[PDB]
Amino acid sequence: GFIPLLRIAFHNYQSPWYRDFEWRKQSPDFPCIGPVKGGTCGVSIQDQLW
Amino acid sequence: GFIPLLRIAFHNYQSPWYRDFEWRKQSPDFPCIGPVKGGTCGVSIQDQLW
Amino acid sequence: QIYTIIEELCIGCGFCTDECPPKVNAILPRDVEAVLDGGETYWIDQTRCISCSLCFVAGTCPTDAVVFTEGGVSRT
Amino acid sequence: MARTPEEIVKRYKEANIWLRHWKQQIGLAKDEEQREMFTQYYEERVQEIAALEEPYRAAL
C-alpha cells in the first residue's frame, strides 16, 4: 500500500522511466500524455495517490 | 448490449465527434489518441467490440 | 528531403514520435503552457533528424500533420 | 473551373495554415540550404495568399 507514497515522494517530477526519455511531469495531476511508448496513463502524483 | 455493434458498423472511420474535429481513425485497434479534448480512450473498433 | 510537422493540426498524440528510432530522438514534445486540448505538440528537430521517413509513411496521425517534402510538400 | 466561394475560403485558410507553418520552419532550419528552401515555400504561399485575398473577401 505504501510504495506509491514513496513514488510520490521521489518521482513527483522525474522518475527513472521519465528521465530516460527526458520528460518531466508538468503538473501534479495530469492523466497521461498519451499513447507514446506503449501508453502513459497514471504516472502523476494525484494518480499515485489513488 | 448491441449499440456498440452499430457504432462499429457506422463509425469505424469517423463518428460525428471525430468529424467535427476532422479526425479519421487510422486503424481498427488503436488504444486512443488522448489526452486531447478531455481524452479519447476507447473509440476504435476493437474497443467497441470489447 | 525534409519531414516537418504542422503544429496547428498536430495534437500531441505520440503516434509519430513513436516511429523515431530512440537513439536519434528527433520528434519532441514541448509540454504544458496551459493545455487540456492537444496536450502537447511534437515538432521535428532538424538539428538531428536522420530523416528515415518513418513517421510519415506509417500512416497513423489522425489530424494529419507529418508533412514530408523535398521539393514540394504532400501529406494526404 | 470557377472555384465556389466555399472552395476559395477553404484554399485561403489552407494557404494561411501553410504560411503559418512555413514561417515557423525558418526558425527551425539547421542550415542555410534548408532555410532557403523553406523561404522559397514561404514566398510561394505569400504569393498564393495575395492572389487569394481579393477572391476571399468576395467569397466571404
Ligand code: SF4
Ligand atoms: S487511454 Fe491511456 S494513453 Fe490514452 S488518453 Fe487515456 S490514459 Fe492517456
Ligand code: SF4
Ligand atoms: S524522418 Fe526519420 S529521423 Fe526524422 S523524425 Fe521522422 S523517423 Fe525520425
Ligand code: SF4
Ligand atoms: S501523429 Fe500527428 S497528431 Fe500525433 S503527434 Fe504526430 S504529428 Fe502530432
